[PDB]
Amino acid sequence: WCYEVQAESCLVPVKWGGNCQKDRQSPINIVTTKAKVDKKLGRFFFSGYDKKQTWTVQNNGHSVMMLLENKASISGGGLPAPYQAKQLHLHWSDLPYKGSEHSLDGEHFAMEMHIVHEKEKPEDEIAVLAFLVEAGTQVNEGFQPLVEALSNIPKPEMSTTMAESSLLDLLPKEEKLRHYFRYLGSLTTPTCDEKVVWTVFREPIQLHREQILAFSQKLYYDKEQTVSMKDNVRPLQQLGQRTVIKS
Numbered sequence: 390w391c392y393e394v395q396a397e398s399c400l401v402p403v404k405w406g407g408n409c410q411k412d413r414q415s416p417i418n419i420v421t422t423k424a425k426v427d428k429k430l431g432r433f434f435f436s437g438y439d440k441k442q443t444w445t446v447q448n449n450g451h452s453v454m455m456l457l458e459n460k461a462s463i464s465g466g467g468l469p470a471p472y473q474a475k476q477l478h479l480h481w482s483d484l485p486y487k488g489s490e491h492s493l494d495g496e497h498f499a500m501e502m503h504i505v506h507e508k509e510k511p512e513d514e515i516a517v518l519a520f521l522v523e524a525g526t527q528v529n530e531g532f533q534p535l536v537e538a539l540s541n542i543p544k545p546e547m548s549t550t551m552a553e554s555s556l557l558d559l560l561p562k563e564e565k566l567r568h569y570f571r572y573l574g575s576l577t578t579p580t581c582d583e584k585v586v587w588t589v590f591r592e593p594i595q596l597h598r599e600q601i602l603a604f605s606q607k608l609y610y611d612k613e614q615t616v617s618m619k620d621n622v623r624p625l626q627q628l629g630q631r632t633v634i635k636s
């Protein structure tokens with residue numbers, strides 16, 4: 390399987406297999422005025438998110454990914470149970486208007502960060518937290534260890550160790566995470582299993598444009614380094630019978 394961009398030089402998204410052609414797929418456009426406010430949707434509680442750890446990050450050929458090894462977890466957020474954190478990864482492009490998987494009222498962001506969690510032992514076995522990323526004038530210092538690590542992992546099957554950092558370092562201030570959207574959907578890469586309760590945070594992370602561009606400048610999808618890693622984004626799927634709600 391591959392993204393559309395890789396085919397312009399494999400199984401493009403409209404041709405994915407598995408559950409990818411089913412009817413409750415992600416990502417989607419969120420029409421914000423149509424997302425009904427829902428009183429059950431409370432703030433999230435983060436556990437282990439503040440902790441400075443040296444994380445390992447890898448280029449897996451589809452993205453860059455940090456292994457979180459159950460070292461953080463979440464509860465609250467309208468979730469039915471606590472979910473343990475497994476891995477963080479990103480989707481991006483190289484334009485201010487074109488790299489998130491979800492869009493808000495039709496606007497795409499320059500990246501989207503997914504923190505994938507799993508129900509602590511059907512439709513909601515997996516909780517993914519999605520954060521939108523846009524340009525700011527300031528270097529986001531919190532993101533610097535990740536950005537710095539990318540030059541050590543240019544090809545797939547490569548991994549490296551980041552300088553000390555916390556998950557919170559990567560995120561908007563916690564008081565700004567109270568507004569979010571929620572819906573039921575799928576993983577956005579094959580086999581696209583329809584098992585995710587999605588959360589998309591309204592408040593975006595701000596990165597320096599060149600911190601964003603550093604993902605496309607340093608990373609490649611292939612050992613031969615012929616295709617820069619960017620536009621690792623699944624096209625939009627239809628909402629269909631589903632509704633989106635918001636806190």
Ligand SMILES: COCCCNC(=O)c1cc(S(N)(=O)=O)cnc1Sc1ccccc1
Nearest residue numbers: 451452475478503505507517575576577578
């Ligand atoms: C982008 O890298 C693509 C490699 C394979 N896909 C995933 O890692 C993946 C993607 C998502 S996403 N794009 O947020 O929908 C969620 N979970 C997983 S892998 C996974 C699945 C279940 C539990 C832990 C990890």
Ligand SMILES: [Zn+2]
Nearest residue numbers: 478480503577
């Ligand atoms: Zn993802």
